[PDB]
Design a protein around this ligand. Structure first.
Ligand SMILES: Cc1cc2nc3c(=O)[nH]c(=O)nc-3n(C[C@H](O)[C@H](O)[C@H](O)COP(=O)(O)O)c2cc1C
Ligand SMILES: Cc1cc2nc3c(=O)[nH]c(=O)nc-3n(C[C@H](O)[C@H](O)[C@H](O)COP(=O)(O)O)c2cc1C
Ligand SMILES: Cc1ncc(COP(=O)(O)O)c(C=O)c1O
Ligand SMILES: Cc1ncc(COP(=O)(O)O)c(C=O)c1O
Ligand code: NA
Ligand code: NA
Lengths: 209, 209
């Protein structure tokens, strides 16, 4: 089926994302519909990328949780701009999001951290994410010891652990097609004869595949 | 099962990639084992990312084909550094590759271009990839007209279409595990007590998850 401007669910790309995300979640052949690739880079243009989970989305943007002292956390703190890719192979769909990133409030991060299974909370205390470690037994040992320490106790959120929110400035909706002639509808914040008004300060236009 | 330094297939990370890639290809639950996310960025640190197919790999690096006048092609030409992510959900594995990018020789690009189905060759001539276009009918029309033009003829490769090779400087092998305590073995080109010699100029070390 065609992916067409006149059959979008919404000209607010966050609501269009919600529509596609719901379809992904309802597809039995998709495991984690909220898996996404996060691209970051140094201020002088050395890029990096890794898989993350989306952990909430709405008008203020796309939220995710990590260690601020990891390789991505140092890049985001020095250069607060990122890009996201969602790829849903069984739907032949891709969503791209570009925007600036801010840290979430500490009390929000505390709340999310304590909502996680206790084993994941202890894992976050164990791991100085992306630091060099000697072997896997080092993690297994420290993890077992922290299980003793936190028996019947609350696990404190590490000072270095928290969340980010990416405020969308660009959102591309890609629908795959034959002959490599895909449908691309791209929203950007802001008129040319091929540029169209969406909701709020959004504009949208079609890009060649 | 543990992902362990003493049970790597190879201390040449390109051969370790080959081993994991073969397992991905042999997994019926993986559609395109060669799908990867490419992260690029401007010289002043504005990142971008999108799905691509890997189209060959070996000692000289990881090859892929695109339009040099696309958004990624302008970034790569201005700032010849990229990052790749392979994510194989059914194997709980991720591979990350960082390195500089060069353009492939024109005669190599010609050969690869003419190996593609004719409909994909014509699609590449139709599409000024990532340029703004008016509607999807614009592509359908131009594509049908180029089918007439190239009936029984060779489709010339566009001057703007070709390939890149990413020479690996960093390669991370990520194997997912319980409690978010994953196995990360990271090769980099080059000794600390946690740094180990691989093949050639490679070093490897374990990173905290
Ligand atoms: C599907 C998937 C989901 C992941 N989700 C997260 C996550 O939400 N946060 C996180 O810190 N790492 C997550 N990881 C691990 C990252 O890919 C990465 O190993 C880690 O964040 C360190 O990246 P860095 O060294 O670039 O900072 C996930 C990995 C996979 C494969
Ligand atoms: C699984 C998958 C594979 C793709 N493979 C390629 C490819 O090899 N080359 C390419 O130019 N675009 C490919 N695309 C399209 C890109 O995601 C993207 O739309 C296009 O390259 C333009 O990106 P840019 O605007 O950042 O330059 C693929 C898309 C998907 C979903
Ligand atoms: C637009 C575009 N160009 C090029 C490629 C490279 O793949 P192939 O040469 O098999 O068409 C792809 C892959 O899906 C693509 O979508
Ligand atoms: C290391 C790591 N931290 C954090 C997360 C975020 O997910 P959750 O809060 O559900 O553990 C993940 C997701 O897989 C992860 O691998
Ligand atoms: Na649905
Ligand atoms: Na195999």
């Amino acid at each position: 089926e065609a992916f067409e401007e006149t059959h979008l669910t919404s000209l607010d790309p966050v609501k269009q994302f919600a529509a596609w995300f719901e379809e992904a979640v309802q597809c039995p052949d998709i495991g984690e519909a909220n898996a996404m690739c996060l691209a970051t880079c140094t201020r002088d243009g050395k890029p990096s990328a890794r898989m993350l989970l989306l952990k909430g989305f709405g008008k203020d943007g796309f939220r995710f949780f990590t260690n601020f002292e990891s390789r991505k956390g140092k890049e985001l703190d020095s250069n607060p701009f990122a890009s996201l890719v969602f790829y849903w192979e069984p739907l032949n769909r891709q969503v791209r999001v570009e925007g600036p990133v801010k840290k979430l409030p500490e009390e929000e991060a505390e709340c999310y951290f304590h909502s996680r299974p206790k084993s994941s909370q202890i894992g976050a205390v164990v791991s100085h994410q992306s630091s060099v470690i000697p072997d896997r037994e080092y993690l297994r040992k420290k993890n077992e010891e922290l299980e003793q320490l936190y028996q019947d106790q609350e696990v404190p959120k590490p000072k270095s652990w928290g969340g980010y929110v990416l405020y969308p400035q660009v959102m591309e909706f890609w629908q795959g097609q034959t002959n490599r002639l895909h449908d691309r509808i791209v929203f950007r914040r802001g008129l040319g004869p091929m540029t169209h008004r969406g909701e709020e300060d959004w504009l949208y236009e079609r890009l060649a595949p």
